[PDB]
From a paper:
We performed 3D variability analysis using the 3.8 Å-resolution consensus map of RhoG/DOCK5/ELMO1/Rac1. This analysis revealed several continuous movements within individual protomers of the DOCK5/ELMO1CTD/Rac1 core region. Next, to capture representative conformations of the DOCK5/ELMO1CTD/Rac1 core region, we divided the RhoG/DOCK5/ELMO1/Rac1 consensus map into 10 classes by 3D classification. Five classes of sufficient quality were obtained with resolutions ranging from 4.2 to 4.5 Å and subjected to atomic model building and refinement. The resulting structures of classes 1 to 5 differed from one another in dimeric molecular dimensions. Consistent with this theory, our cryo-EM single particle analysis reveals that the DOCK5/ELMO1CTD/Rac1 core region is highly flexible and can, therefore, readily transition to a flatter conformation.
The dedicator of cytokinesis (DOCK)/engulfment and cell motility (ELMO) complex serves as a guanine nucleotide exchange factor (GEF) for the GTPase Rac. RhoG, another GTPase, activates the ELMO-DOCK-Rac pathway during engulfment and migration. The DOCK-A (DOCK1/2/5) and DOCK-B (DOCK3/4) subfamilies specifically activate Rac and have an Src homology domain at their N-terminus; the Src homology domain is involved in autoinhibition and binding to engulfment and cell motility (ELMO) scaffold proteins. ELMO is structurally divided into two domains: an N-terminal domain (NTD), consisting of the Ras-binding (RBD), ELMO inhibitory (EID), and ELMO domains, and a C-terminal domain (CTD), consisting of the Pleckstrin homology (PH) domain and proline-rich region.
Residue numbers in the entry:
A (entry chain E): 1 to 269
B (entry chain E): 819 to 1368
C (entry chain D): 530 to 727
The structure:
């Protein structure tokens, strides 16, 4: 083994399974071992791993899932869609801290918040999977971004963790010391979201009407779904069914009459 | 609504004529009408039509400054607090915009017409509960936007040196009152870090002004360094390794985005202290302690840079050693060192590094460095003692070992004869024994304390004047109080022989020195009760066991 | 998921020791346990606190404390953890077979557990329900250094193992694990790394 070359085009050192421990610096390299390799051999790669950033490991080229891309996916245009990938990396780091606190939880009698953590964890991971593909429409992208940001910030909250800002585009722009006052506005808005969620924990996790009020105040148009199943009426003749929304107090209708033709055989005509 | 027109009006009108016409409109407002409304109006002015500045900014602002400066202190600033905050925030926000237009000179104008103002404001706007945070954000944004050239342009070049001295000291004590008693929810880590970076910038600027106008250059009026180093250390007293450690990225996130701010804080203070020069000795004993805790910071590098300052200050005394030696220094060193170490701060590598550096420094130097060598050996012994103490304390969590080790350190201090800390841990042990209700042992320890006293009148040292209550307490009076307490202890300790014994001398003291016969009567009442207790009832004998540890 | 399952159950023990350490914590925090036939002014509730060292048990006829464990010297502060033969669970408890005044009913069949010590003394105790009964038996067997006997324990094992592994497959996303592992490329025998180590 020889002929190693420094390079930064091997950030995504990706395994296949639990590697063999043939090398003195390699082990049963876990599935999720993204490794910061510093040196390239044609068939092998040795460098820092995620598990140990102070130790090398010579890992086969065939075993490496080569990805020339680095942490930044715009210089090489690796993004499936620009401006979204930062979110997936940050949420993965978030999942890492969830695992840490997870270990910290079972040892304690916090099983209520623990279980709610389980269900937010499922929601987050499935959203992660579904946004791994850029197939969704842009409105869907925005809505996912917003709701998952709310969820993760809430998770930071009850875990007593710090906050983030810059709702869209990876939540990194404002923490890039672009301004100061707008940073204060963003932090205050984050605290607004936090207070929303702390008051609404007791409003949704307990009640079910305040959520409806909050949702329906934001929109104006509604449609009532009626699914007719069968008509029971002892007529013996053809029937017309005029079902529509009505105002008993005002003694008038609210929606236009919907007509159903009903046969004399007990079935609609 | 008039500001609503300004956009398309400018689209079909002169910029500056519009500017001056609106200015004339505004200044024409009487000084006591719809103040919040005019603030909203000027906000609706500034957010737009200031995207171009060269022709309006310089003429729009002066009036805006006039209103805010009237809002500075007219004793009726209470309603417009948040509104003025809004104005200031929005204008600075627009100013920081890059595409909008060059404003560095205009930044200077804003600085000159705003800085003392806002500082005075937040000084007066001093309560934590209100929307103080908005003002703080505004002013830190101001600091971030300015320039070292700006910083030194006029704020460093004010009128008579007394006024600028007052300004500087007010700013420093303010920064102390801000770092201490932080203004945010502790979750706005981004905000705290940003505030720290801008405070780094500001305190650096005010360090160069101190150097360039307040070294031996200012041969006199050279006190403020006490405040300056106090502020620096207080700033240096948070945001440490463990906080950086919670997430493994936390170290990494902070360092990549901010680095180890503590590092440059320490190095700046180090070079500044070196710059003190001839004034160092006039400045050592007060600030000896303020250096240990930063030396005690859990890092490596600035520690390596910081212990040598200990040799520097003992050497400063060596210059001043014409009258004695660094005894005054090392006493404070021992005492402080005790408090922080027992606080659970230091490390073993720290003691090794201290020994290495001090020995190395002392090799190059003279006899007084040999005295420093032997005293450093003393210090290392102290350090290992404390480390063993604390590791046992937080390891076993059995009161028995706690008493054992605290007795060990008590005896160590008695060997070292540093009486005050000896008394401190003596009282610690008294607390422990009371927790165990071992009345007899608590009485004995408190007696060892009392034994140091005398029946004289003059309180010889305030060392015996402990922290429980601090006023005159002639040795006579404190000895009386201790004896009363010990008598009570023995009484509930059911050991009345020693009680009577001490009662005898206490009565002697009352009748021959203070002549308060009421005390005689009460004490003799108690002594009669003691004799009754001895004669009447009985007490069980404690079994005694031998324990051989091997 | 055959390579996945192999890799998943193959790295087992960490969750196992975590579970058992939590069980030890649960024993230490303990509760006011339940006695036998504490009907006539006999304190049914009584705490049995494991040592933080986990070598002694603070237990005895403590009062009816609804708050649970109280930290002090119990009626007997020792249970010899070095010599316990076993704990009898269910019908194996002789006090379940009692047919006189201590007739433990058939509603405490799953709540019967007695510590075997002194080779002649037993600690015939009751659990408030099944889950903590199994938890206490788990903790005791952890002191015994053997497997666990709670359905909830298996629940925890499976759920948390699934959580951990599900977190690990993120690097191999959109990629597969050949159930036949990829052949090892031959390593040149020389170790003369042309570029430096580390």
């Amino acid at each position: 083994m020889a002929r190693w070359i420094p390079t930064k085009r091997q950030k995504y050192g990706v395994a296949i399974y639990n590697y063999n421990a043939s090398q003195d610096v390699e082990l049963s390299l876990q599935i999720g071992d993204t490794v910061h390799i510093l040196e390239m051999y044609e068939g092998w790669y040795r460098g820092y791993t995620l598990q140990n950033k102070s130790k090398k490991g010579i890992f086969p080229e065939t075993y490496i899932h080569l990805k020339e891309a680095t942490v930044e996916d715009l210089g090489q245009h690796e993004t499936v869609i620009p401006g979204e990938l930062p979110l997936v990396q940050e949420l993965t780091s978030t999942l890492r801290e969830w695992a840490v606190i997870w270990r910290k939880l079972y040892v304690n009698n916090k099983l209520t918040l623990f279980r709610q953590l389980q269900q937010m964890t499922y929601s987050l991971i499935e959203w992660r999977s579904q946004i791994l593909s850029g197939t969704l429409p842009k409105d869907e992208l925005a809505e996912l971004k917003k709701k998952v940001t709310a969820k993760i910030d809430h998770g930071n909250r009850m875990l007593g963790l710090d906050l983030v800002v810059r709702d869209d585009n990876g939540n990194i722009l404002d923490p890039d010391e672009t301004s100061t006052i707008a940073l204060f506005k963003a932090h205050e808005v984050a605290s607004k979201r936090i207070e929303e969620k702390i008051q609404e924990e007791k409003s949704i996790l307990q009640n079910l009407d305040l959520r409806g009020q909050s949702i329906f105040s934001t929109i104006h148009t509604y449609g009532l779904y009626v699914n007719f199943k069968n008509f029971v009426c002892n007529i013996g003749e053809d029937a017309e069914l005029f079902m529509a929304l009505y105002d008993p107090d005002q003694s008038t209708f609210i929606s236009e009459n919907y007509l159903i033709r009903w046969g004399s055989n007990g079935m609609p005509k | 609504y008039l500001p609503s027109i300004i956009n398309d009006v400018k689209l079909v009108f002169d910029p500056v004529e519009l500017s001056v016409l609106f200015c004339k409109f505004i200044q024409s407002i009487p000084d006591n009408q719809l103040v919040r409304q005019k603030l909203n109006c000027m906000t609706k002015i500034v957010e737009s039509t200031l995207f171009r500045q060269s022709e309006c900014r310089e003429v729009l602002l002066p009036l805006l400054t006039d209103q805010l400066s009237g809002q500075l202190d007219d004793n009726s600033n209470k309603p417009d607090h948040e509104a003025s905050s809004q104005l200031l925030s929005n204008i600075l926000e627009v100013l920081d915009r890059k595409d909008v237009g060059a404003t560095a000179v205009h930044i200077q104008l804003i600085m000159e017409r705003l800085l003392r103002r806002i500082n005075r404001t937040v000084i007066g706007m001093n309560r934590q509960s209100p929307h103080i945070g908005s003002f703080v954000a505004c002013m830190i944004a101001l600091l971030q936007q300015m320039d070292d050239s700006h910083y030194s342009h006029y704020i460093s070049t004010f009128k008579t040196r007394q006024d600028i001295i007052d300004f500087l000291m007010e700013t420093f004590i303010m920064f102390k009152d801000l770092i201490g008693k932080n203004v945010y929810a502790k979750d706005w880590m981004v905000m705290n870090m940003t505030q720290n970076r801008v405070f780094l910038r500001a305190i650096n600027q005010f360090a160069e002004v101190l150097t360039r106008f307040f070294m031996d250059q200012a041969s006199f009026e050279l006190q403020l360094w006490n405040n300056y180093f106090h502020l620096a250390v207080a700033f240096l007293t948070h945001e440490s390794l463990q906080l950086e450690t919670f997430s493994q990225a936390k170290r990494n996130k902070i360092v990549k985005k901010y680095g180890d701010m503590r590092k440059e804080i320490g190095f700046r203070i180090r070079d500044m202290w070196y710059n003190l020069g001839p004034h160092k000795i006039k400045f050592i004993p007060s600030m000896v302690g303020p250096i240990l805790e930063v030396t005690l910071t859990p890092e490596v590098e600035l520690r390596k840079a910081t212990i040598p300052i200990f040799f520097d200050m003992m050497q400063c005394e060596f210059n001043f050693s014409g009258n004695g030696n660094f005894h005054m220094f090392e006493n404070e060193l021992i005492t402080k060192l005790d408090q922080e170490v027992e606080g659970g701060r230091g490390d073993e590598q720290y003691k090794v590094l201290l020994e290495k550096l001090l020995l190395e420094h002392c090799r190059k130097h003279k006899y007084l460095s040999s005295s420093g060598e032997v005293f450093a050996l003393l210090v290392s012994s102290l350090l290992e003692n404390l480390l063993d103490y604390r590791t046992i304390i937080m390891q076993d969590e059995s009161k028995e070992n706690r008493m054992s080790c605290t007795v060990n350190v008590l005896n160590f201090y008695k060997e070292k004869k540093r009486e005050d800390i000896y008394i401190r841990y003596l009282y610690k042990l008294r607390d422990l024994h009371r927790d165990c209700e071992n009345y007899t042992e608590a009485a004995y320890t408190l007696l060892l304390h009392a034994e140091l006293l005398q029946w004289s009148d003059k309180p010889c040292v305030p060392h015996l004047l402990q922290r429980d209550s601090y006023y005159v307490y002639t040795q006579q009076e404190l000895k009386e109080k201790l004896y009363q307490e010990i008598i009570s202890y023995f009484d509930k300790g059911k050991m009345w022989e020693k009680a009577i014994k001490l009662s005898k001398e206490l009565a002697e003291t009352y009748e021959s020195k203070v002549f308060d016969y009421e005390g005689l009567g009460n004490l003799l009442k108690k002594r009669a009760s003691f004799y009754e207790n001895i004669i009447k009832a009985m007490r069980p004998q404690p079994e005694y066991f031998a324990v051989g540890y091997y | 998921s055959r390579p996945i399952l192999e890799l998943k159950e193959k790295i087992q023990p960490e969750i196992l020791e975590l579970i058992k350490q939590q069980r030890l914590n649960r024993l230490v925090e303990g509760t006011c346990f339940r006695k036998l036939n504490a009907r006539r002014r006999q304190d049914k509730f009584w705490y049995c606190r494991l040592s933080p060292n986990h070598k002694v048990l603070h237990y005895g006829d403590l009062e009816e404390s609804p708050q649970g464990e109280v930290p002090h010297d119990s009626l007997q502060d020792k249970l010899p953890v070095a010599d316990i033969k076993a704990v009898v669970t269910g019908k194996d408890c002789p006090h379940m077979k009692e047919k006189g005044a201590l007739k433990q009913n058939k509603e405490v069949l799953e709540l019967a557990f007695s510590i075997l010590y002194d080779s002649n003394c037993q600690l015939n105790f009751i659990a408030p329900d099944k889950h903590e009964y199994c938890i206490w038996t788990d903790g005791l067997n952890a002191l015994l250094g053997k497997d666990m006997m709670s359905d909830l324990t298996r629940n925890d094992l499976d759920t948390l193992l699934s959580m951990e592994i599900k977190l690990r497959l993120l690097d191999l996303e959109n990629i597969q694990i050949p159930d036949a592992p990829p052949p090892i490329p031959k390593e040149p025998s020389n170790y003369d790394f042309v570029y430096d180590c580390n």
